[PDB]
Symmetry: D2
Subunit: 295 residues, 4 copies
């Protein structure tokens, strides 16, 4: 494709017993996603446990993923940090590795004015040296609450080519689409994907795509063909899985599923994240069984 | 068709005269106007009818008149909720006396009540509804009451509860609710996400904007049913352009002003502390009324 | 002078949820005898929002008959509706109250301008009685800024502010901006800290059963006796800890019942009854308080 | 001795190149000591730790120890979102001879209370004996703890204090009540006096860097039952805080320290922007006021 629209998986970062990067597992996961027919990969975001990794660690993941999939699927590098300098450094690396775009979550923890938020994005676009920027809006985790006018301004900053809208507000989703007819708009909450597209999103970036991305591709197609029932059924099945992931723990639940699919060696997350309660293993293992059979 | 509450129903506004008193003629005109645009039914005495700046007798008067005007023609849901359980019980008995098809009550507000107290409140009202199904009313934005999914499941399964008015933009919960209750009558409460709400699981809706463009929402239901996503989306977008304006002008007064220009409501005022519409917005409101009448 | 320690009055009901006049009169006399500076009537504590307008007027009238000319009387005439609030303000004037008060209109969103016109209209109907601006975001849902609060307390006819907020930075900012303002601390559980921050008095639910403790804190801080001020606040907080567990208004009514002041300790539905498991503690608290004073 | 007292949350001075300005850092430390401060809280929010690398944080910790170890108490905030990164800093703090360590509840990602407790246990382990100062700050962390959870944290093996950055003075009293011997630091400077009255027996604050003596005075005044004096000092502190909120908190403090000839270049790291020039007159005059008053 010659654009950034599509269904992109937010890549997980496989670790070993020592909580260190499991390269072999990382490669298998990238290849697994490609096999599922995913349009691209969102790397180094929240889902990649980037915020509990160092700059060089995130950089190492970007390089491996590029090697594995550059030129086969689109690659978006989340380079955001609270620090502008650190974010710029990762932006330069992503450019160097040949990614198709960069992305950054609104800097968090410290309260920054909207003007400071804009300058932060501008500085990163600068270090991105040509790669388009995907503004990343996720108030739930960032705590940064933006008005519609602020979102419009951000999406219109020179160099911005897309918005990752991780919000359950579908009134605002529709308002954004109405204001920007050509904007690449990613639905950020998997559990409302179907309704998100109907409201105006023309794609999505999600962590659960890793184990059932074909289902989301299926909803996009179903909607395009006017098959509401199929779209709803697919969304219902995705939410049944989401209910479980919320019970078991999101990232660790996903890594465990990927473990039973023979993709990830050690399904651990980094501390403070704890391990999956062994009582959930049966359901998680059984889920992997279904997903593989469903393929 | 005889008793099912599924459908698209307008949350009725309450027209007042220049003295802030009930304008009976306009109330009757508004009921017929809604009936003429093919609305499935009316939700009476809710937040939209300004029930919370009305006395019990005033709410009963509206209930009775609406009943005389539309009983038998369309479905009628009486919102009898008050903070007080006893007052709610009184309105409930009157709703049954006037011949309404169902009753509804907002989660009692202001004072913090435990979940068990909310359940007993609903049970008491259901008792006084003597047969009329109860429509649970979830609206955290205004009530300040945030229910968990489990609590919502407990409420909708209480004996005598036949529907839920989900006034929430959380479409994940909407789907979870539909998944847990495959037969439940589930009303989308936020007009601005109607199309998406139906897709998530809602099987109908109740809203303030239905008063001036209810046929658009019916069109959306029709479009989705026929797999015409483009039409559904186009209709939702037009509804949202209107909603964009109402939010700027004031919701209830903006709607009344439009109805006024559509020759339905004589005086478009809401009761104080609600102020009047800022004159700078009249041109858009008049243009909208003109646009809607040509469309209808 | 409206400065002082005033009890937010509870409204006693009978077994059938109707007003219990005899207990209402008893409660008013009980407060007077324990030396309260005045009473705040018809507020949240009085269960005003589960009462009709005539019921609220009935309570105001009886209280005036019992306390007028003996202690200060503030009538909370607030309703969502301005017109209803105006009716109560005019009745308060007729009964001879010293002042009126109104919570910021709730449930429906209102612009700040609309809130100001709401207060103006009530002040007018109050026919001369000073207005006590009532700020309680936790329950009302209306969160005002310092600037807005400044505008409200400077409206003509406004004579005090009931600051029911735990933000003591803002309490200090209000005192700094208004040196002569009658500023009532609204959260009993931080009374001592509220005074240090700037409040020059208070209005509270718990004053009905231990008002002398708060009078004791005003006295202790005035004499520079921080040690005593803290002990008293701490004891007040051991009580508040319990009330939060039992249910606030019904817990206070149960205590007053065991003190033979209130005949029936019930609040109106949807408020439920007190869980029998808390009765031993409530009975023990009543005995302790009666022996203390 | 113990950890009770008035501890200034140390700012991190940078040069024109956004890099650590050791000269100004050392000067700020000594400046604080001369004010009569009881200790320093190093590497916290106020020190822009979350826009510094681990190595940069360690460097800061080491220089301060060299300047103050054995002169005043030293607490090292070593908290990061990552447990392992927090432990690295804890081990370093032990190495440089700090009196205690501290960690803000890990943020951004939603962690269960159990994971939070285990997070503190791990850091405490790596602290190798140094007491832990639990850090409660919902406003910035987004983590909301109940009183029961707070009681559990302060009773964890190895915890010796609680940094209470909350305006809830009812909860402050409840904490003191439940833990009569607990070191309790008031976290919001603008309510310092009231926090002490509610139960706090000291505090940690950013504004202490430019007027720590006023806070010590409040302690003295309350201790001597002088209410009006405590109030006037708090009012003076809040007039300052009102201005800092307008100019930007950290940069406003650095700017004041600049006119006091302590910090060479008063800039914070990006995304933080510079101070609006229209405020310089007020900030400069405030510096003068404080210098004379001192």
């Amino acid at each position: 494709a010659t654009n950034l629209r599509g269904v992109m998986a937010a890549l997980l970062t496989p670790f070993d017993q020592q909580q260190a990067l499991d390269k072999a597992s990382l490669r298998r996961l990238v290849q697994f996603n490609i096999q599922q027919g995913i349009d691209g990969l969102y790397v180094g975001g929240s889902t990649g446990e980037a915020f509990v990794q160092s700059l060089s660690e995130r950089e190492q993941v970007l390089e491996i993923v590029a090697e594995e999939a550059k030129g086969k699927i689109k690659l978006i590098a989340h380079v955001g940090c609270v620090s502008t300098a650190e974010s710029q450094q990762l932006a330069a690396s992503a450019k160097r590795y040949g990614f198709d775009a960069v992305s950054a979550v609104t800097p968090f923890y410290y309260p920054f004015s909207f003007e400071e938020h804009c300058d932060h994005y501008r500085a990163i676009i600068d270090s991105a040296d040509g790669l388009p920027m995907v503004v990343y809006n996720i108030p739930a985790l960032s705590g940064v609450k933006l008005t519609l006018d602020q979102i419009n301004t951000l999406v219109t900053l020179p160099g911005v080519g897309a918005l990752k809208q991780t919000s359950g507000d579908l009134y605002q989703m529709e308002q954004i689409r109405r204001e920007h007819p050509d904007l690449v708009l990613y639905n950020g909450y998997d559990e409302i994907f179907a309704s998100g597209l109907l409201a105006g999103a023309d794609g999505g970036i999600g962590s659960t795509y890793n184990i059932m991305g074909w289902r989301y591709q299926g909803i996009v197609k179903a909607l395009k063909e006017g098959d509401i029932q199929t779209a709803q059924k697919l969304q219902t099945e995705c939410n049944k899985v989401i209910d479980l992931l919320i019970k078991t723990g999101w990232f660790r639940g996903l890594k465990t599923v990927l473990h039973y699919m023979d993709v990830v060696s050690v399904p651990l997350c980094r501390k403070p994240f704890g391990p999956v309660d062994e009582k959930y293993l049966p359901e998680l293992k059984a889920l992997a069984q279904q997903l593989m059979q469903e393929r």
